[PDB]
Amino acid sequence: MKQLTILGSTGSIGCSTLDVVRHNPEHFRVVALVAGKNVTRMVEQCLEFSPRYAVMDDEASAKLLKTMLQQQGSRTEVLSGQQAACDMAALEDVDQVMAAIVGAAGLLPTLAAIRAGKTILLANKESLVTCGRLFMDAVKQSKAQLLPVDSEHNAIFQSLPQPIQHNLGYADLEQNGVVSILLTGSGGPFRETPLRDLATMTPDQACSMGRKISVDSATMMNKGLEYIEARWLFNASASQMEVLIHPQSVIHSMVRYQDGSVLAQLGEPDMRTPIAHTMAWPNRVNSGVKPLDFCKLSALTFAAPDYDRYPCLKLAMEAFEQGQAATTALNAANEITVAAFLAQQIRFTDIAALNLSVLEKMDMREPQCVDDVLSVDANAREVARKEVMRLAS
Amino acid sequence: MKQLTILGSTGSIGCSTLDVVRHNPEHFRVVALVAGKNVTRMVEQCLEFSPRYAVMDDEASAKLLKTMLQQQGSRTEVLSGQQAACDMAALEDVDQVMAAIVGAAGLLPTLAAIRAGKTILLANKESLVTCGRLFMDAVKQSKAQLLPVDSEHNAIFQSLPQPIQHNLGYADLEQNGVVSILLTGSGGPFRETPLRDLATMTPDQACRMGRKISVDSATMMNKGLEYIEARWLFNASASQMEVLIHPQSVIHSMVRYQDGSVLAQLGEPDMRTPIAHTMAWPNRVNSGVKPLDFCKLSALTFAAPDYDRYPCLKLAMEAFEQGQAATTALNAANEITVAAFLAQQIRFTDIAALNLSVLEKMDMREPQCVDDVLSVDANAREVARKEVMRLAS
Numbered sequence: 001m002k003q004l005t006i007l008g009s010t011g012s013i014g015c016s017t018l019d020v021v022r023h024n025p026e027h028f029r030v031v032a033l034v035a036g037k038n039v040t041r042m043v044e045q046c047l048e049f050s051p052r053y054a055v056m057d058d059e060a061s062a063k064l065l066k067t068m069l070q071q072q073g074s075r076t077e078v079l080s081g082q083q084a085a086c087d088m089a090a091l092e093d094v095d096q097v098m099a100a101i102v103g104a105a106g107l108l109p110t111l112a113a114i115r116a117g118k119t120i121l122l123a124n125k126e127s128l129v130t131c132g133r134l135f136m137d138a139v140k141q142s143k144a145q146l147l148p149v150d151s152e153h154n155a156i157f158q159s160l161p162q163p164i165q166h167n168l169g170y171a172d173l174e175q176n177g178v179v180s181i182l183l184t185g186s187g188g189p190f191r192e193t194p195l196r197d198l199a200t201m202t203p204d205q206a207c208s209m210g211r212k213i214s215v216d217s218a219t220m221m222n223k224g225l226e227y228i229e230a231r232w233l234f235n236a237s238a239s240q241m242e243v244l245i246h247p248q249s250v251i252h253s254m255v256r257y258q259d260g261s262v263l264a265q266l267g268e269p270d271m272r273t274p275i276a277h278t279m280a281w282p283n284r285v286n287s288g289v290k291p292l293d294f295c296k297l298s299a300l301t302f303a304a305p306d307y308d309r310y311p312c313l314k315l316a317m318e319a320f321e322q323g324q325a326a327t328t329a330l331n332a333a334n335e336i337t338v339a340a341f342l343a344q345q346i347r348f349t350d351i352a353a354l355n356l357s358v359l360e361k362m363d364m365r366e367p368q369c370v371d372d373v374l375s376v377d378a379n380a381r382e383v384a385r386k387e388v389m390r391l392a393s
Numbered sequence: 394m395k396q397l398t399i400l401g402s403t404g405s406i407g408c409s410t411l412d413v414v415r416h417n418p419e420h421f422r423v424v425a426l427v428a429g430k431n432v433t434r435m436v437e438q439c440l441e442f443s444p445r446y447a448v449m450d451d452e453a454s455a456k457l458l459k460t461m462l463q464q465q466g467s468r469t470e471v472l473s474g475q476q477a478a479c480d481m482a483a484l485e486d487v488d489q490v491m492a493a494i495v496g497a498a499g500l501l502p503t504l505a506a507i508r509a510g511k512t513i514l515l516a517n518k519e520s521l522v523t524c525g526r527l528f529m530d531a532v533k534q535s536k537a538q539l540l541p542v543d544s545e546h547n548a549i550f551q552s553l554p555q556p557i558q559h560n561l562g563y564a565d566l567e568q569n570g571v572v573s574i575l576l577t578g579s580g581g582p583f584r585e586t587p588l589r590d591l592a593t594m595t596p597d598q599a600c601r602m603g604r605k606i607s608v609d610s611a612t613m614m615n616k617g618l619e620y621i622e623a624r625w626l627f628n629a630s631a632s633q634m635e636v637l638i639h640p641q642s643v644i645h646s647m648v649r650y651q652d653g654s655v656l657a658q659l660g661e662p663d664m665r666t667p668i669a670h671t672m673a674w675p676n677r678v679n680s681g682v683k684p685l686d687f688c689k690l691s692a693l694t695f696a697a698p699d700y701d702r703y704p705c706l707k708l709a710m711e712a713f714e715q716g717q718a719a720t721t722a723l724n725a726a727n728e729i730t731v732a733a734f735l736a737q738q739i740r741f742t743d744i745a746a747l748n749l750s751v752l753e754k755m756d757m758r759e760p761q762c763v764d765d766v767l768s769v770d771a772n773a774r775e776v777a778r779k780e781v782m783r784l785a786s
């Protein structure tokens with residue numbers, strides 16, 4: 001029986017993880033749920049899943065949650081705040097931690113699961129985008145298993161040989177006959193826009209979808225960040241990474257082997273797939289996802305990314321070579337500039353341009369701990385806000 | 394250091410295997426080469442690779458080889474005949490047997506490697522098409538490792554989980570999270586021909602790469618035979634097999650999992666890839682095959698086979714359910730009817746129709762040994778010859 005702590009239970013990943021649990025009650029049991037301020041959805045989850053613990057962001061939410069759980073007869077014990085969330089991530093009889101709290105708030109709880117030697121269903125980009133070296137060192141030192149839940153990394157991982165899958169952070173790609181990792185992305189809505197029109201695209205043209213990630217997919221900042229992550233996670237050099245546009249997103253990513261073989265994972269866009277794969281690894285369970293119907297697909301195509309069309313993708317690649325200050329700064333800047341584009345303060349092409357300008361303006365030492373990473377992030381947001389103000393009168 | 398016996402060294406699979414050995418001298422050494430009557434090529438192969446043994450079909454061929462090797466100072470000892478080939482397949486210090494002799498002549502030498510507990514690089518169809526129950530029983534008893542060299546099966550194999558790979562025959566697909574095996578094929582040159590034109594196709598049109606295999610691709614007999622083999626090799630029921638047309642042949646075949654994931658192997662058409670995959674398993678070597686270039690591919694498409702277009706594929710699926718007498722008779726009838734079509738004695742559509750007629754005429758007790766299978770084969774060829782003469786005056 002796998003016992004689970006779900007960090008970020010009330011977002012789509014958390015609900016989807018719960019759907020796997022709901023349909024596999026003989027294999028998984030929820031011990032702890034952690035969320036933010038969504039008391040109502042947390043009530044329903046505690047009543048369906050009977051975890052021992054639930055944690056909210058603050059005392060106000062925790063008190064509401066307590067009152068409502070109590071009204072319904074629940075035995076779930078209610079806590080609040082960051083430490084409590086780290087504590088659930090490290091609980092003694094927990095086997096797996098779904099690490100789905102995103103942003104800076106996901107860093108310490110994910111690191112607490114790692115240092116407790118858990119199996120971490122990794123479902124946030126900040127861990128490896130901002131703290132990849134810190135976190136990969138902690139994984140080695142603490143004997144944690146990372147299992148990537150993100151669609152492209154989960155596909156690479158399914159496509160990697162068993163000795164790498166079980167030894168992330170140590171495994172040598174080359175020694176295991178791996179030539180490169182083929183990280184695929186859709187190329188976004190402006191994949192075929194003449195370059196000259198990029199300057200004038202609007203937030204509606206760039207975006208059912210998720211507006212930030214949607215813009216990140218238009219700039220391919222999203223693949224840029226996936227590139228930074230994959231290199232830490234899979235221990236890949238620059239020459240062991242290829243980024244390929246694949247507009248249909250049926251192939252989720254691939255791995256190229258020494259004999260010419262390429263292994264690929266394919267599927268529906270439903271996150272229950274990669275989530276169930278990690279929960280059940282090295283075995284499988286039913287996820288509720290429809291079997292992929294190959295007779296109803298668009299033709300599958302591929303093309304090389306053009307860095308004049310996708311300067312963010314190139315910027316992410318160069319930031320990796322500059323270290324975790326640089327990838328942390330790029331990520332934070334990009335949150336500010338995308339937000340500005342979406343609020344109609346700057347042009348679409350000013351995302352990449354101001355992302356570049358913010359990195360050019362910083363000169364930060366390599367972070368040595370999480371606090372350092374938060375300090376780079378805070379600083380880069382400030383440099384970014386000011387650049388936005390320079391353009392947005 | 395892996396020591397090899399190559400059964401069928403002078404054909405294309407044999408030459409390709411030697412190309413892999415040639416570029417990996419630190420990993421593979423040839424102990425024995427077995428060929429038929431091609432003395433000239435066997436000389437060059439013995440001279441380059443210094444095997445301990447060379448076996449030819451007969452004493453006349455063996456005497457020529459011995460004279461020619463003597464004149465070049467070779468120490469290779471020369472043998473002849475079917476028993477010597479079985480003895481090469483069973484040698485104490487051989488690890489791997491490339492089983493590339495095709496037809497009936499390949500049955501006893503493959504079975505010898507299997508009864509000897511060897512790693513078998515399985516490169517002939519008649520083994521599992523005609524003797525699948527016999528050979529998978531002998532595999533269970535000796536714990537021989539089968540590694541399929543044929544492109545589709547090799548892809549399936551690479552796409553299956555590790556506990557299945559390491560125990561074919563005992564493996565339970567369902568228990569390992571596998572929903573089904575996705576066997577792909579091109580659909581042949583008449584994939585889009587109007588149905589009523591089929592009756593009048595000529596041999597040159599069917600042969601857009603042997604003429605027989607070409608015709609087999611056109612009728613999808615080839616995929617039918619592969620379907621029969623895959624069921625034996627992977628212990629798959631009818632409901633665990635799907636057959637999919639994929640006209641570009643870039644995907645080599647796939648495996649569908651319980652969580653909705655599909656794993657696939659892709660590559661160049663070059664047989665050094667699956668050969669090198671089996672020789673190196675569970676590691677990898679360089680095979681000389683260049684990396685697959687995703688920016689130079691046709692759009693990848695898929696469609697369901699239509700049994701009115703391809704009645705041989707349905708015949709093979711049905712013959713499977715009727716047992717090894719049926720699949721043996723089918724394969725044998727097909728050698729005859731295809732040869733008749735190529736020699737302009739029957740029409741293209743008469744291949745499927747006479748293949749059916751031969752199976753209808755046979756009253757077929759289950760083979761209990763290789764001699765039983767050979768007797769079904771011989772009798773089905775006679776029934777098929779007579780049916781051809783019914784049509785071909």
Ligand SMILES: CN(O)C(=O)CC[C@@H](c1ccc(F)c(F)c1)P(=O)(O)O
Nearest residue numbers: 151185186187188217222223249269
């Ligand atoms: C789901 N996921 O992991 C993502 O990274 C989403 C954005 C990506 C994406 C876009 C369109 C799709 F149709 C799809 F499926 C995935 P991209 O970065 O453009 O490849």
Ligand SMILES: CN(O)C(=O)CC[C@@H](c1ccc(F)c(F)c1)P(=O)(O)O
Nearest residue numbers: 544578579580581610615616642662
């Ligand atoms: C390579 N191989 O194993 C074969 O069995 C050859 C015939 C097959 C085939 C046909 C055309 C191609 F272009 C190709 F690449 C492979 P099919 O049965 O039609 O899928």
Ligand SMILES: [Mn+2]
Nearest residue numbers: 150151152226
């Ligand atoms: Mn992703």
Ligand SMILES: [Mn+2]
Nearest residue numbers: 543544545619
């Ligand atoms: Mn084949």
